[PDB]
Structures are given as structure tokens and as C-alpha cells.
UniProtKB/Swiss-Prot annotation, chains A, B, C:
GO terms for biological process: adult locomotory behavior; amyloid fibril formation; behavioral response to cocaine; cellular response to copper ion; cellular response to epinephrine stimulus; cellular response to fibroblast growth factor stimulus; cellular response to oxidative stress; chemical synaptic transmission. GO terms for molecular function: actin binding; alpha-tubulin binding; beta-tubulin binding; calcium ion binding; copper ion binding; cuprous ion binding; cysteine-type endopeptidase inhibitor activity; dynein complex binding. Highly expressed in presynaptic terminals in the central nervous system. Expressed principally in brain. The modification Phosphoserine is found at S68. Soluble monomer. Homotetramer. A dynamic intracellular population of tetramers and monomers coexists normally and the tetramer plays an essential role in maintaining homeostasis. Interacts with UCHL1. Interacts with phospholipase D and histones. Interacts (via N-terminus) with synphilin-1/SNCAIP; this interaction promotes formation of SNCA inclusions in the cytoplasm. Interacts with CALM1. Interacts with STXBP1; this interaction controls SNCA self-replicating aggregation. Interacts with SNARE components VAMP2 and SNAP25; these interactions allows SNARE complex assembly and integrity. This is Alpha-synuclein. Residues 7-48 are annotated as: 4 X 11 AA tandem repeats of [EGS]-K-T-K-[EQ]-[GQ]-V-X(4). GO terms for cellular component: actin cytoskeleton; axon; axon terminus; cell cortex; cytoplasm; cytosol; extracellular region; extracellular space. Belongs to the synuclein family. The keyword Transferase does not apply.
Length: 80, 80, 80
């Protein structure tokens, strides 16, 4: 088996704070997620989480919830 | 099996805070999610989460809920 | 078996703080996640977590929740 399980359980005066992000840039180039190829048979890309791309990227309190991904590629059963 | 499970369960005076993002840029180029290829057979892309792309990208409290993805490509059963 | 399990359980006046990020740059180039190849058969990419890419990337309190990934590629059962 190639199974995969994950669980989480909860049985439940603070200040949040400050997050300051200042960016001064010029002539920026960014590639978040890239798959380049030549003479390929399959190209699968599954995004279950969060992909934050930019010239100024900020992520806060992003991934705390339940999600599942199940991928299976190839599988050539060429008996004779 | 290629199964995949995930669960979450809950049995339930704070200040949120401050998030300041200032960006001064010029001539920016951004690619969030890209798949380039030549002479391919399949190109699948499933987005179950969040993809935030820009010159100034901010994500807050994004992915906390239930979702599932199930992909299967190829599968050539060429018996003779 | 190629199984994989993970669990978490909880049975439950502080100041958050300060996070200052200042960036002054010029002619930046960034590649977050890249897979280059030639004459390939499969190219799978599953994102269950968080990918933060940029010229100025900040991540705070990102990955605390339940998620699962299950991938299986190849699997050539070529008996004769």
C-alpha cells in the first residue's frame, strides 16, 4: 500500500503584534513553480496547499486545515 | 492502494494586530505556476488550494477547510 | 507497505511582538521550485504545504494543519 493518513483533534488576553514589510526594488523577475521539459509523456501538477508568488510575497496563518491529494501516473501493465 | 485520508475535529479578548505591506517597484515580471513542454502526451493541473500571484501578493488565513484531489494519468494497459 | 501516518491532539496575557522586514534591492532573479529535464517519462509535482516565492518573501505561522499526500509513479508490470 501507498496510503497516507493524517489527523488532528482539539478539545478546547494576548496582543496580535505588528508585521511590517517594506520593499523597494527595480527590475525583478520571479518564477514561483515551473516545470520545463522536452519529449515528455506526462506532466501533472496538483496544488492542495498555498502558492504565494510575487515581487513582494507575504503569507501569514496560511495552512491549518484538512486536505488530501492522491496522484498516480505511469502504470503501464504491458504483459506481452 | 494509493489512497490518502485526512481529518480534523474540534470540540470548542485578543487583538488581531496590524499587517502593513508597502511595495515600490518598477518593471516587474512574475510567473505563478507554469508548465512548459514540447512533444508531450498529457498536461494536467488541478488547483484545490490557493494560488496568489502578483507584483505584490499577500495571503492571510487562507487554507483551513476540507478538500480532496484525486488524479490518475497514463495507465496504458497494452497487453499484446 | 509504504504507509505514513501522523497525528496531533490538544486538550487545552502575552504580547505578539514586532517583525520588521525592509528590503532595498535591484535586478533580482528568483526561482522558487523548478524541475528541468529532457527526454523524460513523468513529471509530477504535488504541493500540499506552502511555497512562498518573491524578491522579498516573508512567512509567519504557516503550516499547522492536517494534510496528506500520496504519490505513486512508474509501476511497470511488464511480465513477458
Amino acid at each position: 500500500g501507498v496510503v497516507a493518513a493524517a489527523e488532528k483533534t482539539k478539545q478546547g488576553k494576548t496582543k496580535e503584534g505588528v508585521l511590517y514589510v517594506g520593499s523597494k526594488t527595480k527590475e525583478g523577475v520571479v518564477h514561483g513553480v515551473a516545470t520545463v521539459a522536452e519529449k515528455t509523456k506526462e506532466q501533472v501538477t496538483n496544488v492542495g496547499g498555498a502558492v504565494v508568488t510575487g515581487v513582494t510575497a507575504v503569507a501569514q496563518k496560511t495552512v491549518e486545515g484538512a486536505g488530501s491529494i492522491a496522484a498516480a501516473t505511469g502504470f503501464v501493465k504491458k504483459d506481452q
